[PDB]
Structures are given as structure tokens and as C-alpha cells.
């Protein structure tokens, strides 16, 4: 499925995303969309040999298992292909996780080099929330 902006925005929210670890809900849709573009069938193999899983391109490194990535952990207790669903949960869920682990949204490093400080309330701008 591919979310439109606002769409996102309504499921990300519904999914208690929203200031989940103090991050706005224009930090999420902002990272969904250069992750994903919305998509959530976006795969995408790192050099390593991982690969990056649905609207926040979670990583089968430590996150998910995907069955092909040596030496790796399932931290989130999931299959990958789960991370690909319509159904945001599995990802909403994983992404606490993840947000919870230390480093913040800096886990996405297109988080940080594309929405860390700038507008991102543009991000839900117009959205009946």
C-alpha cells in the first residue's frame, strides 16, 4: 500500500506514534516518506547483506528476521515480510522499539540528515487528525 500523506499521518496517530518518545508526528511522516515514499513494500539490500523492511525501512541486522542476514538478531520477534503489510502495526510496533534503543529517530540516519530540525509540522499540515 502506498499511504497518502495525510492517511499516514491518521494511521501513525492512531497507532500511538504521535510524541511517542517525544517525537512530533511530522518527525514520523517526514522519515516514512524518504524512507519509504509511503510505501509499504519498499525493500531495499544494504552492503552488508541486511535488508531495510516497509514504511521505515527496519533492518533484518537486529530488528526482524528475514532468514538471510548472517549473523543477525530479531529483536522486534517478527518476520520481515510482516514489516510489508497494509497494516501498519508490526512497523508502528518494531519503530518503538527501535526509538526506544538509545539513540532516538537518529536510528534513521535519513531522519537525521533530511528531517532532524527542520519544519517537519509542514509534514501534517491541512491533516484532520
Known sequence: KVFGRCELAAAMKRHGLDNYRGYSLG???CAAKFES???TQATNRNTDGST???ILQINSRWWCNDGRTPG???LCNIPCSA???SDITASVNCAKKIVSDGNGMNA???WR???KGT???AWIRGCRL
Open 113 to 115: 540528515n533530511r528531517c
Open 83 to 85: 514489516l510489508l503489510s
Open 27 to 29: 518527525n514520523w511522516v
Open 52 to 54: 531495510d523492511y516497509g
Open 72 to 74: 543477525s538478531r530479531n
Open 37 to 39: 515514499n509511503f510505501n
Open 119 to 121: 519544519d517537519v509540522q
Open 108 to 110: 534513521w540516519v535519513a
